[PDB]
Amino acid sequence: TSVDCTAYGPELRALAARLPRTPRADLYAFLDAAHTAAASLPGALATALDTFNAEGSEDGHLLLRGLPVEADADLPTTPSSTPAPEDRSLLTMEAMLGLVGRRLGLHTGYRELRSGTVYHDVYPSPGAHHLSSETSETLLEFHTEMAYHRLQPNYVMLACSRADHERTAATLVASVRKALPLLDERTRARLLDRRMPCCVDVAFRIAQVKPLYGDADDPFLGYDRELLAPEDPADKEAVAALSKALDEVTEAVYLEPGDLLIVDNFRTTHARTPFSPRWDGKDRWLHRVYIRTDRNGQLSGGERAGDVVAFTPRG
Ligand SMILES: NCC[C@@H](O)[C@@H](C(=O)O)N1CCC1=O
Ligand SMILES: O=C(O)CCC(=O)C(=O)O
Ligand SMILES: [Fe+2]
Protein backbone atom coordinates (compact mmCIF):
# COMPACT_ATOMS: atom_id res chain seq x y z
CA THR A 1 0.00 0.00 0.00
CA SER A 2 1.28 3.45 -0.97
CA VAL A 3 0.58 6.96 0.24
CA ASP A 4 1.69 10.01 -1.73
CA CYS A 5 2.87 12.45 0.95
CA THR A 6 4.03 15.21 -1.42
CA ALA A 7 1.32 17.64 -0.32
CA TYR A 8 2.43 17.22 3.29
CA GLY A 9 5.90 18.57 2.58
CA PRO A 10 5.39 21.89 4.47
CA GLU A 11 3.51 20.49 7.45
CA LEU A 12 6.00 17.63 7.79
CA ARG A 13 9.06 19.89 7.42
CA ALA A 14 7.53 21.86 10.28
CA LEU A 15 6.94 18.91 12.60
CA ALA A 16 10.50 17.79 11.83
CA ALA A 17 11.79 21.15 13.07
CA ARG A 18 10.18 20.50 16.47
CA LEU A 19 12.67 17.70 17.08
CA PRO A 20 16.12 18.13 18.73
CA ARG A 21 18.88 18.54 16.12
CA THR A 22 21.24 16.01 17.74
CA PRO A 23 19.01 12.92 18.29
CA ARG A 24 21.65 10.45 19.52
CA ALA A 25 22.89 12.85 22.23
CA ASP A 26 19.61 12.23 24.04
CA LEU A 27 17.52 9.73 22.08
CA TYR A 28 14.83 9.30 24.74
CA ALA A 29 14.19 13.05 24.68
CA PHE A 30 14.28 13.09 20.88
CA LEU A 31 11.81 10.21 20.52
CA ASP A 32 9.57 11.68 23.20
CA ALA A 33 9.47 14.95 21.24
CA ALA A 34 8.69 12.95 18.09
CA HIS A 35 5.82 11.23 19.89
CA THR A 36 4.35 14.63 20.70
CA ALA A 37 4.76 15.87 17.16
CA ALA A 38 3.30 12.59 15.85
CA ALA A 39 -0.07 13.63 17.29
CA SER A 40 -0.01 16.48 14.76
CA LEU A 41 0.49 14.37 11.63
CA PRO A 42 -1.86 15.27 8.74
CA GLY A 43 -5.16 13.54 9.45
CA ALA A 44 -5.08 11.44 6.30
CA LEU A 45 -1.52 10.24 6.93
CA ALA A 46 -2.30 9.62 10.59
CA THR A 47 -5.34 7.52 9.64
CA ALA A 48 -3.39 5.47 7.13
CA LEU A 49 -0.71 4.83 9.74
CA ASP A 50 -3.23 3.91 12.44
CA THR A 51 -5.20 1.67 10.06
CA PHE A 52 -2.05 -0.12 8.87
CA ASN A 53 -0.84 -0.43 12.45
CA ALA A 54 -4.08 -2.15 13.52
CA GLU A 55 -5.11 -4.08 10.41
CA GLY A 56 -1.89 -4.53 8.47
CA SER A 57 -2.51 -4.96 4.73
CA GLU A 58 -2.82 -7.72 2.17
CA ASP A 59 0.55 -6.83 0.66
CA GLY A 60 2.10 -6.35 4.10
CA HIS A 61 3.76 -2.96 3.73
CA LEU A 62 2.98 0.74 3.63
CA LEU A 63 5.11 2.88 1.37
CA LEU A 64 5.05 6.60 2.13
CA ARG A 65 6.21 8.41 -1.00
CA GLY A 66 7.40 11.96 -1.50
CA LEU A 67 8.24 12.74 2.10
CA PRO A 68 10.53 15.73 2.49
CA VAL A 69 14.25 15.01 2.07
CA GLU A 70 17.38 17.13 1.61
CA ALA A 71 18.59 17.88 -1.91
CA ASP A 72 21.39 15.43 -2.64
CA ALA A 73 24.03 18.17 -2.41
CA ASP A 74 22.76 19.06 1.04
CA LEU A 75 23.16 15.51 2.38
CA PRO A 76 26.41 14.51 4.11
CA THR A 77 28.72 12.09 2.31
CA THR A 78 27.25 8.60 2.36
CA PRO A 79 28.52 6.96 5.60
CA SER A 80 31.46 4.57 5.20
CA SER A 81 31.14 2.97 8.62
CA THR A 82 28.97 2.12 11.61
CA PRO A 83 28.09 3.19 14.29
CA ALA A 84 27.17 6.78 13.38
CA PRO A 85 28.67 9.72 15.32
CA GLU A 86 26.46 10.46 18.32
CA ASP A 87 26.93 14.12 17.33
CA ARG A 88 25.57 13.74 13.78
CA SER A 89 22.99 16.43 12.99
CA LEU A 90 19.43 15.29 12.32
CA LEU A 91 18.59 14.28 8.74
CA THR A 92 15.02 14.86 7.52
CA MET A 93 14.35 11.22 6.65
CA GLU A 94 15.49 10.40 10.17
CA ALA A 95 13.02 12.96 11.46
CA MET A 96 10.30 11.24 9.44
CA LEU A 97 11.34 7.88 10.89
CA GLY A 98 10.93 9.46 14.32
CA LEU A 99 7.51 10.96 13.68
CA VAL A 100 6.01 8.03 11.77
CA GLY A 101 7.87 5.60 14.02
CA ARG A 102 6.37 6.88 17.30
CA ARG A 103 2.96 7.01 15.64
CA LEU A 104 3.17 3.21 15.30
CA GLY A 105 5.19 2.16 18.34
CA LEU A 106 8.54 2.15 20.14
CA HIS A 107 11.89 2.36 18.36
CA THR A 108 13.93 -0.54 19.69
CA GLY A 109 17.67 -1.14 19.73
CA TYR A 110 19.15 -4.65 19.85
CA ARG A 111 22.29 -4.75 21.98
CA GLU A 112 24.31 -7.33 20.01
CA LEU A 113 23.32 -5.56 16.80
CA ARG A 114 25.11 -2.47 15.50
CA SER A 115 26.65 -1.48 18.84
CA GLY A 116 23.16 -1.52 20.31
CA THR A 117 22.19 1.60 18.37
CA VAL A 118 18.65 2.50 17.26
CA TYR A 119 19.09 4.45 13.99
CA HIS A 120 20.90 2.24 11.47
CA ASP A 121 22.60 3.51 8.34
CA VAL A 122 22.15 1.02 5.51
CA TYR A 123 24.84 1.67 2.90
CA PRO A 124 27.05 -0.74 0.94
CA SER A 125 30.55 -1.53 2.18
CA PRO A 126 33.45 -3.47 0.58
CA GLY A 127 33.69 -7.23 1.07
CA ALA A 128 30.38 -7.31 2.95
CA HIS A 129 29.05 -10.51 4.53
CA HIS A 130 26.38 -12.29 2.47
CA LEU A 131 23.66 -11.88 5.13
CA SER A 132 24.47 -8.18 5.66
CA SER A 133 22.61 -5.00 4.74
CA GLU A 134 26.04 -3.93 3.50
CA THR A 135 25.83 -6.31 0.55
CA SER A 136 25.13 -4.89 -2.89
CA GLU A 137 26.43 -7.11 -5.70
CA THR A 138 24.89 -10.17 -4.06
CA LEU A 139 21.15 -10.62 -3.56
CA LEU A 140 20.06 -10.12 0.04
CA GLU A 141 17.87 -13.23 0.39
CA PHE A 142 14.31 -13.12 1.75
CA HIS A 143 14.15 -12.75 5.54
CA THR A 144 11.68 -11.83 8.28
CA GLU A 145 13.90 -9.53 10.34
CA MET A 146 15.12 -11.34 13.47
CA ALA A 147 12.37 -13.98 13.25
CA TYR A 148 14.39 -16.07 15.72
CA HIS A 149 14.46 -13.32 18.38
CA ARG A 150 11.86 -13.31 21.17
CA LEU A 151 11.68 -9.50 21.05
CA GLN A 152 11.41 -9.50 17.25
CA PRO A 153 10.04 -6.07 16.26
CA ASN A 154 6.58 -5.79 14.69
CA TYR A 155 7.84 -3.30 12.10
CA VAL A 156 11.02 -2.62 10.16
CA MET A 157 11.11 0.88 8.67
CA LEU A 158 13.43 1.94 5.84
CA ALA A 159 13.69 5.61 4.78
CA CYS A 160 15.65 6.57 1.67
CA SER A 161 18.00 9.56 1.51
CA ARG A 162 19.97 8.27 -1.43
CA ALA A 163 19.09 5.48 -3.87
CA ASP A 164 21.86 3.65 -5.74
CA HIS A 165 23.28 5.44 -8.82
CA GLU A 166 21.47 3.44 -11.50
CA ARG A 167 18.50 2.84 -9.19
CA THR A 168 18.65 -0.90 -9.76
CA ALA A 169 18.40 -1.95 -6.11
CA ALA A 170 14.85 -3.19 -5.52
CA THR A 171 13.46 -3.93 -2.08
CA LEU A 172 11.39 -7.09 -2.28
CA VAL A 173 8.55 -8.01 0.07
CA ALA A 174 6.40 -11.15 0.13
CA SER A 175 3.17 -11.11 2.15
CA VAL A 176 1.77 -14.11 4.06
CA ARG A 177 -1.75 -12.96 3.19
CA LYS A 178 -1.12 -13.35 -0.53
CA ALA A 179 1.05 -16.45 -0.28
CA LEU A 180 -1.14 -18.46 2.13
CA PRO A 181 -4.02 -19.03 -0.34
CA LEU A 182 -1.47 -20.81 -2.55
CA LEU A 183 -0.63 -23.50 0.02
CA ASP A 184 -2.91 -26.50 0.47
CA GLU A 185 -4.63 -27.52 3.70
CA ARG A 186 -2.01 -30.11 4.57
CA THR A 187 0.92 -27.70 4.25
CA ARG A 188 -0.74 -24.95 6.30
CA ALA A 189 -1.61 -27.31 9.15
CA ARG A 190 1.91 -28.73 9.05
CA LEU A 191 3.49 -25.25 9.14
CA LEU A 192 1.14 -23.59 11.63
CA ASP A 193 2.69 -23.59 15.13
CA ARG A 194 5.37 -26.11 14.17
CA ARG A 195 8.62 -24.85 15.70
CA MET A 196 11.55 -25.59 13.40
CA PRO A 197 15.31 -25.14 13.88
CA CYS A 198 16.63 -21.72 12.83
CA CYS A 199 20.12 -20.27 12.96
CA VAL A 200 20.61 -16.64 13.90
CA ASP A 201 22.38 -13.70 12.26
CA VAL A 202 26.10 -13.19 12.86
CA ALA A 203 25.67 -10.53 15.57
CA PHE A 204 23.61 -12.92 17.73
CA ARG A 205 26.05 -15.85 17.48
CA ILE A 206 19.46 -22.80 19.01
CA ALA A 207 16.10 -21.21 18.21
CA GLN A 208 12.74 -22.68 17.22
CA VAL A 209 10.83 -20.56 14.72
CA LYS A 210 7.24 -21.29 13.69
CA PRO A 211 6.94 -20.55 9.96
CA LEU A 212 3.28 -19.73 10.62
CA TYR A 213 1.47 -19.15 13.91
CA GLY A 214 -1.59 -17.44 15.34
CA ASP A 215 -5.08 -17.41 13.86
CA ALA A 216 -5.07 -20.12 11.19
CA ASP A 217 -7.36 -17.94 9.08
CA ASP A 218 -4.82 -15.11 9.14
CA PRO A 219 -1.51 -16.42 10.59
CA PHE A 220 1.68 -14.44 11.12
CA LEU A 221 4.85 -15.39 9.27
CA GLY A 222 8.36 -16.25 10.40
CA TYR A 223 10.58 -17.06 7.42
CA ASP A 224 14.25 -16.79 6.54
CA ARG A 225 15.54 -18.24 3.28
CA GLU A 226 18.91 -18.85 4.86
CA LEU A 227 18.59 -19.52 8.59
CA LEU A 228 15.40 -21.61 8.74
CA ALA A 229 16.62 -25.22 8.90
CA PRO A 230 13.78 -27.82 8.98
CA GLU A 231 14.51 -31.44 9.98
CA ASP A 232 11.69 -33.85 9.09
CA PRO A 233 11.34 -34.34 5.32
CA ALA A 234 7.68 -33.43 5.76
CA ASP A 235 8.90 -30.19 7.30
CA LYS A 236 11.39 -29.36 4.55
CA GLU A 237 8.61 -30.01 2.04
CA ALA A 238 6.15 -27.63 3.70
CA VAL A 239 8.76 -24.86 3.95
CA ALA A 240 9.73 -25.24 0.31
CA ALA A 241 6.02 -25.03 -0.54
CA LEU A 242 5.99 -21.76 1.42
CA SER A 243 9.25 -20.55 -0.11
CA LYS A 244 7.76 -21.00 -3.57
CA ALA A 245 4.42 -19.42 -2.69
CA LEU A 246 6.33 -16.42 -1.33
CA ASP A 247 8.49 -16.12 -4.44
CA GLU A 248 5.20 -16.25 -6.36
CA VAL A 249 3.72 -13.26 -4.53
CA THR A 250 6.92 -11.21 -4.45
CA GLU A 251 6.36 -7.46 -4.74
CA ALA A 252 9.11 -4.99 -5.69
CA VAL A 253 9.66 -1.50 -4.29
CA TYR A 254 12.37 0.79 -5.66
CA LEU A 255 13.24 3.18 -2.89
CA GLU A 256 14.05 6.75 -3.91
CA PRO A 257 14.82 9.82 -1.78
CA GLY A 258 11.82 10.78 0.35
CA ASP A 259 10.54 7.21 0.53
CA LEU A 260 9.70 5.58 3.84
CA LEU A 261 8.80 1.90 3.73
CA ILE A 262 6.98 0.31 6.65
CA VAL A 263 7.43 -3.47 6.57
CA ASP A 264 4.96 -5.48 8.67
CA ASN A 265 7.64 -7.73 10.13
CA PHE A 266 5.08 -10.25 11.40
CA ARG A 267 3.34 -10.90 8.07
CA THR A 268 6.15 -10.35 5.57
CA THR A 269 9.60 -11.47 4.49
CA HIS A 270 11.87 -9.05 2.59
CA ALA A 271 15.00 -8.84 0.46
CA ARG A 272 17.14 -6.59 -1.72
CA THR A 273 18.24 -7.22 -5.31
CA PRO A 274 21.83 -6.58 -6.54
CA PHE A 275 23.36 -3.22 -7.42
CA SER A 276 26.91 -1.98 -7.98
CA PRO A 277 28.26 0.73 -5.65
CA ARG A 278 30.69 3.36 -6.90
CA TRP A 279 32.47 4.30 -3.67
CA ASP A 280 32.15 7.94 -4.71
CA GLY A 281 30.55 9.18 -1.52
CA LYS A 282 27.06 9.06 -3.00
CA ASP A 283 26.18 5.37 -2.83
CA ARG A 284 22.77 4.11 -1.71
CA TRP A 285 21.88 5.35 1.78
CA LEU A 286 18.89 4.12 3.74
CA HIS A 287 17.96 4.76 7.38
CA ARG A 288 16.55 1.84 9.37
CA VAL A 289 14.78 1.50 12.72
CA TYR A 290 12.78 -1.28 14.35
CA ILE A 291 9.42 -0.59 15.95
CA ARG A 292 7.83 -2.57 18.79
CA THR A 293 4.11 -2.61 19.56
CA ASP A 294 1.61 -4.13 22.01
CA ARG A 295 1.09 -6.98 19.54
CA ASN A 296 2.01 -10.62 20.43
CA GLY A 297 4.05 -9.99 23.60
CA GLN A 298 6.93 -7.78 22.40
CA LEU A 299 6.46 -5.67 25.49
CA SER A 300 6.36 -6.55 29.18
CA GLY A 301 5.85 -3.05 30.50
CA GLY A 302 7.95 0.00 31.30
CA GLU A 303 9.42 0.07 27.79
CA ARG A 304 10.33 3.38 26.16
CA ALA A 305 11.18 4.32 22.58
CA GLY A 306 14.96 4.14 22.48
CA ASP A 307 15.37 1.13 24.75
CA VAL A 308 17.97 -1.42 23.74
CA VAL A 309 17.09 -5.05 24.45
CA ALA A 310 19.25 -8.15 25.04
CA PHE A 311 19.00 -11.31 22.96
CA THR A 312 16.80 -14.28 23.86
CA PRO A 313 16.16 -16.95 21.21
CA ARG A 314 12.64 -18.24 20.60
CA GLY A 315 12.07 -21.88 21.49
N1 LIG B 1 19.30 -10.92 6.51
C2 LIG B 1 20.08 -10.32 7.60
C3 LIG B 1 19.55 -8.91 7.99
C4 LIG B 1 20.70 -7.84 8.04
O5 LIG B 1 20.16 -6.61 7.68
C6 LIG B 1 21.42 -7.72 9.45
C7 LIG B 1 22.34 -6.49 9.51
O8 LIG B 1 21.94 -5.40 9.89
O9 LIG B 1 23.61 -6.59 9.15
N10 LIG B 1 20.50 -7.76 10.60
C11 LIG B 1 19.30 -7.09 10.95
C12 LIG B 1 19.23 -7.89 12.20
C13 LIG B 1 20.49 -8.55 11.77
O14 LIG B 1 21.22 -9.40 12.24
O1 LIG C 1 18.41 -2.49 1.21
C2 LIG C 1 17.22 -2.73 1.35
O3 LIG C 1 16.28 -2.09 0.67
C4 LIG C 1 16.72 -3.78 2.30
C5 LIG C 1 17.81 -4.13 3.35
C6 LIG C 1 17.22 -4.98 4.45
O7 LIG C 1 16.83 -6.11 4.22
C8 LIG C 1 17.13 -4.46 5.82
O9 LIG C 1 17.80 -3.33 6.15
O10 LIG C 1 16.44 -5.09 6.63
FE1 LIG D 1 16.12 -6.86 6.54
Nearest listed ligand to the Cα of residue 149: 1
Instruction: Give the number of C-alpha atoms closer than 13 A to the C-alpha of residue 206, restricted to the C-beta side.
Output: 16
Strand order in the sheet with 171-175: 140-143, 268-272, 171-175, 251-253
Q: Which of 114, 171, 255 to mutate to test the pocket of ligand 2 (most atoms within 8 A of CB)?
A: 171
Is the peptide bond prior to 83 cis by the omega test (within 30 degrees of 0)?
A: yes
Give the C-alpha separation, 260 to 5, whole Å. Answer: 10
Give the C-alpha separation, 166 to 169, whole Å. Answer: 8
The interaxial angle of helices 43-55 and 92-104, nearest 10 deg, is 50
Q: How far is the CA of 39 from the centre of ligand 1 (A)?
A: 31
Give the C-alpha separation, 227 to 180, whole Å. Answer: 21
Index of the ligand 1 atom closest to the CA of residue 114: 8
Q: How far is the CA of 60 from the centre of ligand 2 (A)?
A: 15
Q: How far is the CA of 269 from the centre of ligand 1 (A)?
A: 13
Q: Give Cβ neighbours of residue 264 (< 8 Å, ≥ 6 apart).
A: 52, 56, 57, 60, 61, 154, 155, 175
Residue 4 one-letter amino acid = D
Strands 61-65, 260-264: pairing is antiparallel
Nearest listed ligand to the Cα of residue 108: 1
Q: Is 120 annotated as a binding residue?
A: no
Protein residues whose CB sits closer than 6 Å to any atom of ligand 1: 113, 131-133, 143, 145-146, 201, 203
CB 63 within 8 A of CB 259: yes
Q: Is 185 annotated as a binding residue?
A: no
Index of the ligand 1 atom closest to the CA of residue 141: 1
Residue nearest to atom 5 of ligand 1 (CA): 133
Give the C-alpha separation, 131 to 142, whole Å. Answer: 10
**Full 3-state SS string of 68-86:** CCCCHHHCCCCCCCCCCCC
Give the resolution to one decimal, in Å.
2.1
Architecture of domain 1-315: 4-Layer Sandwich (3.60)
Write out the DSSP string of the chain: -EEE-GGGHHHHHHHHHHS-S-GGGGHHHHHHHHHHHHTTS-HHHHHHHHHHHHH--TTSEEEEES-----GGGS-PPP-SSSPPTTPPPPHHHHHHHHHHHHH-EE-EETTSGGG-SSEEE---TT--TTSTT--SS-EEEE-TTTTBTT--SEEEEEEEE--TT----EEEEEHHHHGGGS-HHHHHHHBT--EEB---GGG---EE-SEES-TTS-EE--BTTTB---SHHHHHHHHHHHHHHHHH-EEE---TT-EEEEETTTEEEEE-------SS---EEEEEEEE-SGGGS--SS--TT-EE---B--
* Cα 282 off chain centre by: 22
Give the max Cα distance, the chain.
57
